[PDB]
Structures are given as C-alpha cells and as structure tokens.
Amino acid sequence: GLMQFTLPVRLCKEIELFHFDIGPFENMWPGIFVYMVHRSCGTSCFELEKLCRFIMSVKKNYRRVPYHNWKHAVTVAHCMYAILQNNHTLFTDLERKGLLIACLCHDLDHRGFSNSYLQKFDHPLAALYSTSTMEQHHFSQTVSILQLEGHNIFSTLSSSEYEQVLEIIRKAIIATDLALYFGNRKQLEEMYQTGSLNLNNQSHRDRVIGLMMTACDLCSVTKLWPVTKLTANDIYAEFWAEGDEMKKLGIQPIPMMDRDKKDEVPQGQLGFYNAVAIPCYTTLTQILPPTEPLLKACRDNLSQWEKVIRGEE
Ligand SMILES: Cc1ncc(C)n2nc(CCc3nc(C4CCCC4)cn3C)nc12
Ligand SMILES: [Mg+2]
Ligand SMILES: [Zn+2]
C-alpha cells in the first residue's frame, strides 16, 4: 500500500514521452507496466498481488513470434499511458483501469498470421469468429485469464462497473483490427469537421477509444528512426513467413508478404504512412491536441523512408 515502483532516473523521465522504447531487458517490462498503472490509475486501482499474477499469466500467453510478442504488448500499453497522462481529465476512472489492460491483452496468443491467412487455411478460429478473427480470440483469452483463481484484478468493481470495464476492453481490442480502422477514422473525421463530435455520447467515445487503440497499436512509426527501422524488420519477418505459408497453400501472397519483393519495402512504408499512419495521428491530434508529438514523430519517420528511397540511406 505504501510500496511504490520507481524506475532509474533516465526511465523515470523518458517513460513520460511518447517516443520511449521499453528496452531489451524483458525482466523490467512487468515493473514498467505496474509503474504506468500506478501513475495513470492509482496505487489503489488493483491489488498488487492479483495484478502481478495477471501480468505474468498474460506474458505466458504471448508467443515467441518476431513482432506480435510480449514486447509489442507492453509497447502498445506504454503509448496508451502517454496518451492518458497527456489528457488527464478526459477519461473516466473505469476507462483508465480498462485501457492499459486492454493494450497489454490486445494480441494475446497471436500466432504471427493475419485474419486472412486463418480464413484461407480454414483454421478452427475462422469458423468460431467470421470477422476480426484474431481480435475476438484475444478478447476471449483476456476473459479466460481474468477467470483464473487469484487473477481477477477487477474483483472490487460492482457487477455493472465490472460489465462496463469488460465492455471497454472488448471494444478496445476489436478496434485493433486494422480492417475496421479506415471506416472508424472516416466517421471521426466527418464528426470532428461538422462539429457533431460529442464526448458525452457513449458511441462517440467508443470511436475515439478505437482510434487511440489504432494509434497505440501502430506506435512503432512514432519512435526514434533506429527503433522504427529495426521494428519494421520484425514486422516484415512475420509477413514473409505468412507469405511462405500462403505459397504452401498454392496461393501467391500479396506483395507485402512476399520476401522476393524485399526491394519494394521502402515504397510499401510510404504507402502505409500516407494511407494509415499519418491519417490516424492527424485525426487523433485534432480530437486530442496533446497527442501531436505522435503525428510529428510519424512525419519525421515518413521523411526517413523518403531518404531511404533517394539512396541517402
Ligand atoms: C510500420 C508498420 N506498422 C504496422 C503495420 C500493420 N504495418 N504494415 C506494414 C506493411 C506496409 C507495406 N509494405 C508493402 C510491401 C513492401 C514490399 C512490397 C510491398 C505493402 N504495404 C502496405 N508496415 C507496417
Ligand atoms: Mg492485433
Ligand atoms: Zn497489436
């Protein structure tokens, strides 16, 4: 109760910034997450023993894949921490509790394959969940772990508060399905620009949290260039393995997943920043002005990919 997590000075200062990298010391990531829960939510939000036990079960249920791993989960939660800390008064007590947990859980038991590969392989999960296949799986795994004995971190919430927090987590995790992002941001764009956006409207909050989830999920493009560049290798290493698996089913993969088209990566990154990243952080910055450093960082990394194409690196 009088037991705070503290971090070394460089981490204590840099963890508050959007571009913070959680580092290569896996054993410090749980501590980092608890630190962020404590400052973002309070030392009273969760029973430390339950929270620690929940964090270690979540870690255990992330797999050793190149990108969609326990490091990604903690990275996505740290970006959410930075958004929440820079927008103190916009979020409910329940939202603050649920969104860091949603972020830590959002890719639980990912196998390194897209929804599309599960459907073409005819994976059991593709019969159980027809759309947002992996994301319904991630939420299902979150509920499983919350129901392990001694793992119910929400035990002190009322029956209806409990139902609301699980409903925030569910919508937040579903929103990390990038297929849903394009329409969600188009609607948020229209609402902001016609002045109809209203944060007392629960369906509007839902959309805004969906956009925050895309922002945190893609936050590799908002890091220092060397972090962005080395993360992009992990991202493509999964896509190229999926491409190999597509070729095994007798299907030419899309170029994104074809390791034979490595040379075109710099141009694929431009399309991605222009079609997905920049629009995401732009609308986010319009809705939550203090999130501007994410947009600014993303624009800097777009300019670094432009330099790569111009053979200036
Ligand atoms: C940086 C980043 N973060 C998150 C996600 C989901 N992605 N997806 C990507 C792929 C971006 C792309 N490359 C290509 C290929 C390049 C070689 C042939 C074409 C196509 N396209 C869309 N980059 C990211
Ligand atoms: Mg995902
Ligand atoms: Zn993710």
DSSP assignments along 132-156, one per residue:
SHHHHHHHHHHHHHHTSTT--TTTT
**Does residue 16 sit within a domain?**
no
**Does residue 158 sit within a domain?**
yes
Q: Is the CB of 31 under 6 A from ligand 1?
A: no
Work out the angle at residue 64's Cα, subtended by the Cα atoms of residues 27 and 135, and round it to the nearest 5 degrees. Answer: 105
Residues 107, 180: Cα–Cα separation, whole Å: 16
Resolution of this deposited model, Å: 2.1
Residues 159, 143: Cα–Cα separation, whole Å: 15
Token readout for 38 is 């404590």
For residues 61, 151, 102, 172, the Cα torsion angle rounded to the nearest 10 degrees is: 110
End-to-end CA distance of the chain: 51
CATH of the domain at 66: 1.10.1300.10
Q: Which atom of ligand 1 lies nearest, measured to the CA of 231?
A: 1
- Phi, psi for residue 70 in degrees, rounded to 5: -55, -40
Residues 168, 98: Cα–Cα separation, whole Å: 6
DSSP conformational letter for 169 = H
- Phi, psi for residue 251 in degrees, rounded to 5: -130, 120
Q: Is the CB of 271 under 6 A from ligand 1?
A: yes
What Rg do the C-alpha atoms of the chain give, in angstroms?
19
Token readout for 196 is 């109809």
DSSP code per residue over 244-311: HHHHHTT-PPPGGG-GGGGGGHHHHHHHHIIIIIHHHHHHHHHHSGGGHHHHHHHHHHHHHHHHHHTT
**Does residue 20 sit within a domain?**
no
Residues 161, 310: Cα–Cα separation, whole Å: 54
List Cα–Cα distances, 120 to 66, 128, 245, 249, in angstroms. Answer: 22, 14, 10, 8
Q: Are 55 and 30 in contact (CB under 8 A)?
A: yes
Residues 47, 155: Cα–Cα separation, whole Å: 9
Which ligand is closest to the CA of 301, given by its number? Answer: 1
Ligand 1 pocket test, pick from 235, 259, 270 with the greatest ligand atom count within 8 Å of Cβ, gives: 235
Residues 290, 286: Cα–Cα separation, whole Å: 9
List Cα–Cα distances, 192 to 86, 177, 207, in angstroms. Answer: 20, 22, 12
68 is catalytic: yes
Which ligand is closest to the CA of 260, given by its number? Answer: 1
Q: Are 110 and 63 in contact (CB under 8 A)?
A: yes
**Does residue 52 sit within a domain?**
yes
Q: Are 298 and 278 in contact (CB under 8 A)?
A: yes
- Residue 303: how many other CB atoms lie within 10 Å: 11
What is the domain range of residue 213? 28-310
**Does residue 1 sit within a domain?**
no
Residues 82, 65: Cα–Cα separation, whole Å: 26
**Does residue 2 sit within a domain?**
no
**Does residue 7 sit within a domain?**
no
List Cα–Cα distances, 256 to 5, 168, 259, in angstroms. Answer: 42, 32, 8
Work out the angle at residue 217's Cα, subtended by the Cα atoms of residues 214 and 221, and round it to the nearest 5 degrees. Answer: 100
Q: Are 62 and 76 in contact (CB under 8 A)?
A: no
Residues 138, 115: Cα–Cα separation, whole Å: 12
**Does residue 6 sit within a domain?**
no
Q: Are 227 and 220 in contact (CB under 8 A)?
A: yes
Q: Is the CB of 260 under 6 A from ligand 1?
A: no
Which ligand is closest to the CA of 110, given by its number? Answer: 2
Q: Which of 76, 61, 80, 26 is nearest to 151 (CA)?
A: 61
136 Cα to the center of ligand 3, angstroms: 13
Residues 313, 311: Cα–Cα separation, whole Å: 5
- Broken C–N links (> 2.5 Å) in the chain, after residues: none
Ligand 1 pocket test, pick from 65, 269, 298, 300 with the greatest ligand atom count within 8 Å of Cβ, gives: 269
Q: Is the CB of 298 under 6 A from ligand 1?
A: no
Q: Is the CB of 313 under 6 A from ligand 1?
A: no
Q: Which of 79, 69, 89 is nearest to 36 (CA)?
A: 79
**What method was applied to determine this entry?**
X-ray
Q: Is 252 annotated as a binding residue?
A: no
Number of domains in the chain: 1
3-state secondary structure of 241: helix
Q: Is 138 annotated as a binding residue?
A: no
- Segment holding 303, helix H or strand E: helix 292-309
List Cα–Cα distances, 102 to 15, 173, 257, 275, in angstroms. Answer: 19, 6, 28, 25
Work out the angle at residue 272's Cα, subtended by the Cα atoms of residues 229 and 139, and round it to the nearest 5 degrees. Answer: 90
